[PDB]
Structures are given as C-alpha cells and as structure tokens.
C-alpha cells in the first residue's frame with residue numbers, strides 16, 4: 118500500500134490502514150449496522166475479526182495494539198515483570214519517558230540537574246533495559262509522556278496502550294489510546310493478544326463554538342460534573358458535532374485527557390482539519406495525507422448508536438473550576454467565591470500552577486501569557502506564587518523563542534522542568550506547614566487528598582491555565598475575570614480582556630535539545646544490573662500458585678468508608694523513590710484510606726494484639742503469622758491512577774481478596790493480574806452486614822466459572838453466620854491467572870517449563 122512510517126524514529130514500521138479497513142469490513146458484514154468511530158478503530162484491531170463475539174459491555178475483545186508507551190514511575194515495574202518473563206526483545210514499538218521523578222524546588226535547569234544526580238540509579242536501569250530489550254528512551258527533561266506522544270507518536274486510527282491513566286490524551290489526534298497497568302503492557306510487548314472488555318459508547322455532541330474566556334478544559338470540567346467520577350466506567354466517550362471544528366488539536370487532547378476522571382476507558386474525536394494542521398506542523402504531513410485517503414474509516418458511520426448521548430452547547434458554556442477534593446464537584450468561576458465562603462474553603466490562593474499533561478501545550482502557554490501581559494501593562498504582578506510547566510522540550514524552546522516564557526517570568530512565575538512535578542506530589546513545598554488549611558488552584562486534572570504536597574488539608578481546584586493566571590494575579594477565589602476589576606499601579610481600575618493566542622507557532626516549532634535515545638538494534642549486549650542491596654530496585658520473586666482450597670476464616674484488614682482512589686491505596690509524592698522496589702513501597706499500603714471503625718486514616722485494630730496501628734505494619738504482622746486477609750471497600754474502589762503497585766502491594770503483604778460495591782476498571786484488571794480476587798457485592802446493601810470484627814469464608818473457588826457468583830459466609834463473633842453472594846467479571850483466561858498465582862506465572866507456565 119503506502120509505506121508511511123509510524124514515527125520519525127521507526128522508519129521501517131509502517132502504518133497499516135489497509136489492515137484496519139480489512140478488519141472493519143469483516144466486522145460490519147457480521148454486524149450489519151453503523152459503527153461508531155471507536156468501534157471502527159477498536160474492532161479494526163481485533164486479533165480475530167471473523168470469530169470474535171462482540172457485545173458492548175459484555176464480551177472481552179482480544180486486540181493487537183500498535184505500540185506501547187511507558188513513563189518512568191510505572192516503567193520500572195513493567196520492565197521488572199518483563200525481565201521475569203525471560204523474553205529477549207519487545208514485539209511492538211515501545212518507549213520509556215522520564216517525566217515523573219523530577220522534583221520542583223529551584224525551577225527549570227537546576228531541578229533537572231539535581232534529578233539526574235539523585236535518580237541516576239533508576240535512569241540508568243531504564244536506559245540499560247531499554248537498550249537491551251529494544252525500547253526507545255526519552256531522557257529526563259524531554260517532556261511529560263502524553264505531550265511527547267501527541268507530538269511524535271499518536272496518529273488517526275492508532276491503537277496505543279500506555280502505563281498511565283491519561284494515555285487517552287492521544288484521542289485528540291483521532292487514535293484510541295488506553296491506559297493500562299504494567300502487566301498489561303508486558304502482554305503486548307511479549308506478543309500475546311491484549312484483552313479489553315467491549316466498551317459501551319457515550320456520544321457527546323458539541324454544538325456552537327468556544328468564545329472568550331471559555332476554553333477546551335471547560336468542556337471536560339462540565340462533562341465531569343454531569344457524568345460524575347464514575348459515570349464513564351466501561352465506556353468510550355466519542356465527541357462529535359459541529360462544535361468540534363471550533364477546538365484546536367491540543368484542545369481536543371485536553372478534553373480526551375480528563376475523560377480519565379469520569380472512569381472512561383478512553384475518549385476520541387473524529388479526524389478533521391485541525392488534526393491535519395497539527396500533523397503537518399509536527400513534521401507528519403505524509404501521515405495526514407494517508408489519513409485523508411482513509412478518512413471514511415476515521416470518522417463515525419452515519420447514524421451510529423450511542424448508548425448515552427449528551428449535548429453541550431459551546432456558545433453557552435462559561436469558565437468552570439472543579440473541586441476541592443474530587444474533580445467532578447463543578448462550579449462556574451462566577452460562583453466559586455460564594456460557595457467557598459459558604460463551605461469554609463480558604464479564599465486566598467497561595468499558589469497557582471499551570472501545566473500537567475492536561476494543559477501544557479503551546480496554545481495554553483500563549484493564552485496564559487495573554488492574561489499576564491495585560492497585568493504587566495498595568496504594572497501588576499502575581500499576588501499568589503505562580504509556577505509554569507511546559508509540556509515538552511519543543512514547547513519550552515518555542516515559547517521561549519516566541520516570547521511567552523519571559524512574559525510569564527516577568528509577572529512573577531517560575532518555569533519548572535518539563536515534568537509532572539507538583540502534579541504527582543514531586544514538589545518541595547515549604548510555604549505551609551503540614552495540616553495547614555490552604556487553597557491552591559491548578560490547570561491539572563486530579564485534586565485528591567494530599568496528592569500535590571502530601572498535606573491532606575490543601576484544597577486544590579482544577580481549572581484552565583488562563584483562569585489560573587487570572588486568579589494568581591488577583592490572589593483570591595473571590596475574583597471573576599469576566600466581570601471584576603483590578604487596580605493598576607497608576608490608580609486606574611481595569612478589566613482583563615479574554616485571552617487570544619495562536620493554537621500553534623506561526624513559525625515552525627523549535628525542537629530544543631536532543632533527548633531521544635534509540636535502542637542499538639545491533640548490540641543489545643547490555644547486562645541490566647540491579648544491585649541486591651538497592652533501596653530503589655528489586656527483582657521480583659514470583660507469587661505463590663493457588664493451593665486448590667477455598668479461602669476460609671479470612672481476617673478483614675480494613676473496611677474502607679467512602680472514596681478510595683489509588684492515591685489513597687498507594688500514595689505517590691515521596692514514595693515514587695521506591696517504585697522499582699516492591700517491599701519498600703509496600704510500607705505505604707492503604708495509609709490514606711478512611712477506616713469505618715474509627716473514621717481515621719492509617720489506624721486499624723490488630724485482631725491479635727488488640728492495638729490500633731498503621732495498616733502496613735498490621736498487614737505485615739498478619740502475613741508473618743499466616744493470617745490471610747481481605748479489604749472491604751465501598752463504591753468505585755481504586756479510582757484514579759493506573760499504578761499497579763496498588764494491586765502488587767496487597768498481594769505482597771498477604772491479601773487475598775478485595776470485596777467492594779464497585780471497582781474502577783484499571784484497578785480491577787490489575788488485581789486479577791496479580792492473582793487477587795476482586796469481587797463485588799451481588800447486593801450492595803450487604804456492605805452493611807460486614808463488621809470489621811467478622812471473619813469471611815469465600816467458597817466455590819473449585820468450580821470458579823465466568824458468570825457464576827461465589828458464596829461468602831460472614832462468620833460473626835457471637836456465632837451467627839450469614840451467606841451472601843459475590844459477583845466477579847472473570848472469563849476463563851483470567852481464572853487461569855488466579856489458579857497460577859498471577860498472569861506472569863501463567864505466561865511462564867506456557868513457556869513449556
């Protein structure tokens with residue numbers, strides 16, 4: 118067909134739209150109905166399009182991704198599992214991105230130089246393992262993973278999986294990009310088919326056009342308030358409508374990105390002329406030309422059926438700010454001042470932060486600089502502290518060149534290294550004490566308890582970069598940029614003008630410095646060394662196979678009340694130092710979850726000693742004494758980040774099952790991958806029948822089967838027993854992971870030894 122390379126770094130890997138077309142055509146002859154765009158790309162990547170059972174929300178699809186992307190806080194454990202597999206090389210184009218371990222302290226260059234000294238052990242390990250197994254490596258400083266992906270790797274119709282829940286960002290370029298745990302990435306790098314539950318499709322029809330202060334971020338802050346953090350679970354969100362051509366390509370990526378906060382499997386936009394423009398400006402005019410020839414397959418079919426349809430009129434949409442402790446608590450910026458006052462949220466803004474993968478593009482930096490230049494023209498500077506993270510080295514070099522970075526420095530901002538930084542808590546924050554109540558406003562996406570600075574009393578609000586800039590200048594949540602006045606140096610009252618800025622550089626992007634390291638695919642004679650006394654890296658010892666018995670008289674380690682994100686289960690921030698060391702990072706297990714017994718975080722009753730203490734210590738005491746334990750959870754357990762450490766850590770410390778009212782998708786898959794049993798209440802009111810003091814017997818594991826419930830006997834201390842039923846979503850592939858002790862153990866069994 119055409120021989121168009123997948124990226125500038127893989128000149129020999131060609132885009133296979135011929136394959137995609139071929140598969141869409143097998144499937145539509147079977148289904149005889151219009152297909153949505155996400156159905157065309159997902160079913161077009163089926164391992165077996167002729168025989169695959171396709172029922173939305175019901176069957177598990179066996180798929181063949183085009184490429185794998187990893188960031189350095191999850192790549193370490195994905196590569197340690199890959200090293201256990203014993204396989205010699207990755208089977209599909211794969212990259213490692215070093216963006217999560219650079220701490221914000223001194224700003225830009227000084228922080229990067231310091232992270233390279235401090236994290237030498239880990240960057241060495243990832244570069245060496247990348248060279249040995251044929252994985253491309255983007256060096257520290259290169260940029261946040263999703264911005265490097267949109268700039269170099271995402272294209273219309275790609276199916277990309279990434280070890281990061283914001284991999285959906287690539288939906289801004291018409292690809293299906295899905296976040297997974299490290300063990301799922303091991304499946305694809307190993308060449309075995311990846312399984313995904315067939316998604317429902319929510320359509321969001323965009324009407325009108327964005328005007329003034331309203332930005333792409335407001336579309337997804339509004340959708341999150343409408344759908345709530347659990348409303349997109351099990352579905353792909355497909356944006357369509359006349360309003361789409363009003364949004365820039367990085368704007369569409371912003372909206373697809375934060376679809377992660379409603380639990381969606383991913384989000385996508387149809388191929389259109391804004392995408393084409395972005396592809397040509399990023400040196401990929403040949404891919405835009407090929408996608409023009411296959412365009413029918415890169416837009417939805419006429420009259421396709423959405424399981425839910427939402428319509429948003431972009432012209433009536435106004436600026437929003439979401440939070441404080443969930444991203445779906447949505448307020449118009451015009452009302453946040455009064456709600457904060459009413460609710461006791463601090464009105465003074467201590468720090469305004471722009472960046473993260475959600476809002477770090479060239480256009481976001483231009484729109485922020487446009488607010489800031491107006492303040493500067495009146496002799497004002499920021500009243501709040503103000504930090505700026507460029508998304509990639511190319512964006513940093515270009516905003517510097519085009520003058521935006523100096524405007525942002527002159528109003529009072531500090532430009533940080535091209536890295537996650539304060540978004541995953543990598544921030545040496547010293548202006549507040551721990552436990553001090555304060556408000557920060559960010560252009561990030563999550564605002565979970567203690568995630569940005571480890572202070573559970575920080576009230577963080579997420580909004581657009583131009584509203585962060587306007588609120589940082591005013592210093593208070595009681596300031597609406599659309600209606601209120603500032604007072605210049607000169608004594609006159611002035612109003613801020615709605616920002617306007619170019620979506621892309623008029624001139625070409627300046628690439629900045631060299632940060633990609635291609636694998637030698639010649640040599641590969643690297644020995645990967647992991648020192649046996651390392652505190653940051655540890656080779657894995659396989660988990661135990663199932664003993665063949667039911668699980669009787671399980672102790673409850675903790676019955677969790679309310680919201681329990683993966684940041685509650687396995688905190689980030691300072692714990693990122695141990696992301697390649699399972700035993701050391703297991704010391705944070707569930708320290709943020711709230712215990713229903715006493716309403717406290719990290720304080721549970723040891724059943725043997727009758728002392729209340731830290732959850733990790735108590736799980737290790739039970740493991741030491743052979744007591745097998747369970748966690749009981751509430752709704753949407755494991756919400757948030759894809760980090761598989763939230764499943765590896767309970768397995769490592771002796772946990773057996775997690776029984777909840779519902780699970781977020783990636784965490785439920787990570788639990789099944791590590792040989793734990795994620796089970797849900799067949800009647801969610803049974804959560805109230807289980808007391809912290811009960812012992813539980815799970816029965817029926819011997820004829821464990823897809824669609825059959827398991828029985829749970831609740832043994833109350835007074836002698837009363839009650840039987841309840843527990844549902845699971847295991848298919849027979851996944852039951853084999855459980856019988857083997859983990860999916861990795863199962864994979865190694867199939868190696869005929």
Ligand SMILES: O=C([O-])/C=C(/C(=O)[O-])[C@@H](O)C(=O)[O-]
Pocket residue numbers: 190191217280281282283296541689757758759760
């Ligand atoms: O902890 C991790 O390295 C995983 C992430 C994820 O999958 O989203 C992180 O980027 C985040 O934002 O929590």
Ligand code: SF4
Pocket residue numbers: 261262281283473474475536537540541562
């Ligand atoms: S959400 Fe934050 S921590 Fe996760 S990839 Fe994006 S910028 Fe990094």
